[PDB]
């Protein structure tokens, strides 16, 4: 009975984990992925789309698509859709709802209890909105854990000396959260935070798209930003291009017959993006992280040599550009690998759900 799911109710992507005999296992979506886009869309027929199909229709159904609702949880923010205003609690509850339903299917049982994580900078109103979202989704929020806390829990960071210094570098899709933590008897307390609420993987992908458009245009003279379908697959290509460059030095973008030019000539986007070019481009954004990393270090008065452990969360931290930056940032103090960065927080949450009960 102690076990329950942990939910990483993320800004752009949410993840569910569950303790199975004490072993946190990340729950897969009905869509075939363990990572669920934190998007809730109302198709123009009264149909609730949560996750990837909400993402798929977002560009055409922006009218009724809510993305990154998490950014407004502590407010009175609501979207009036066909007679009903959906408050940020309710919208995020729909995520939780989908996530609950898949976990139910996965597990073959109804899990009512859950730890849901929130960013360390969320205030209690924002945490209460999260609790409310949980209750709306039929979840009984056991506790809310800060995402940095959960991240440290995920790696089982129980130092034999109790007291431990954690740097948690969170580069998610749409947000950047830096946090220094103090661990004591399984409790991971926050000492300082900083970050950039508008920097994440979305901008790194976006620069790849921009590059693709710029090079396409450079060759054909066509503004691909004017065609939404061009832009959706450019984002898919960009996403995967970044992913490939997390290990490869080069990746190939292949989007044939994208759109229509003046002469109806075959417009095949065929581009080679090197990891070096990728950095030449994206370092405009990688450099934005250096300042808030340092501001946490400065706010606590704790040098990098005094950090016992570094935790990287957010899938964008899988990039070697980020990894090497972390190595400079932390004096070579090596980030702990073994849990997927996007799943880390969910893992910790699941763990706290068992510890807690």
């Amino acid at each position: 009975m102690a076990r329950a799911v942990g939910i990483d109710l993320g800004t752009t992507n949410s993840v569910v984990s569950v303790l199975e005999g004490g072993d946190p296992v990340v729950v897969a979506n009905s869509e075939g992925s363990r990572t669920t886009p934190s998007i809730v869309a109302f198709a123009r027929n009264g149909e609730v789309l949560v996750g990837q199909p909400a993402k798929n229709q977002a560009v055409t159904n922006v009218d009724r698509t809510v993305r990154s609702v998490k950014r407004h949880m502590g407010s009175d923010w609501s979207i009036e859709i066909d007679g009903k205003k959906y408050t940020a609690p309710e919208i995020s509850a729909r995520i939780l709802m989908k996530l609950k339903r898949d976990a139910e299917a996965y597990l073959g049982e109804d899990i009512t209890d859950a730890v849901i994580t929130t960013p360390a900078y969320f205030n209690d109103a924002q945490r209460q909105a999260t609790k409310d979202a949980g209750q709306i989704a039929g979840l009984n929020v056991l506790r809310i854990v800060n995402e940095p806390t959960a991240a440290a829990l995920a790696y089982g960071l129980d130092k034999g000396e109790k007291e431990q210094r954690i740097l948690v570098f969170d580069l998610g899709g749409g947000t950047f959260d830096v946090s220094l933590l103090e661990i004591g008897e399984g409790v991971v307390e926050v000492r300082a935070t900083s970050g950039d609420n508008h920097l994440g993987g979305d901008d790194w992908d976006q620069r790849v798209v921009d590059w693709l458009v710029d090079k396409f245009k450079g060759t054909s003279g066509i503004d691909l930003t004017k065609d939404k379908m061009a832009m959706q697959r450019l984002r898919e290509a960009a996403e995967k291009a970044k992913i490939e460059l997390s290990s490869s030095q080069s990746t190939s973008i292949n989007l044939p017959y994208i759109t229509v030019d003046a002469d109806k000539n075959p417009l095949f986007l065929d581009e080679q993006l090197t990891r070096a070019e990728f950095q030449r481009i994206t370092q405009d954004l990688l450099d934005r992280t250096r300042k808030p990393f340092q501001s946490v270090i400065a706010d606590t008065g704790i040098s990098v040599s005094e950090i016992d452990h570094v935790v990287l969360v957010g899938g964008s931290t899988r990039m070697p550009a980020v990894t090497d930056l972390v190595k400079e940032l932390t004096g070579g103090k090596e980030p702990n690998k073994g849990v997927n960065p996007d799943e880390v927080v969910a893992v910790g949450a699941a763990l706290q759900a068992g510890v807690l009960k």
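The longest strand covers residues 187-196. Residues 201-280 form a domain with the Actin; Chain A, domain 4 fold (CATH 3.90.640.10).
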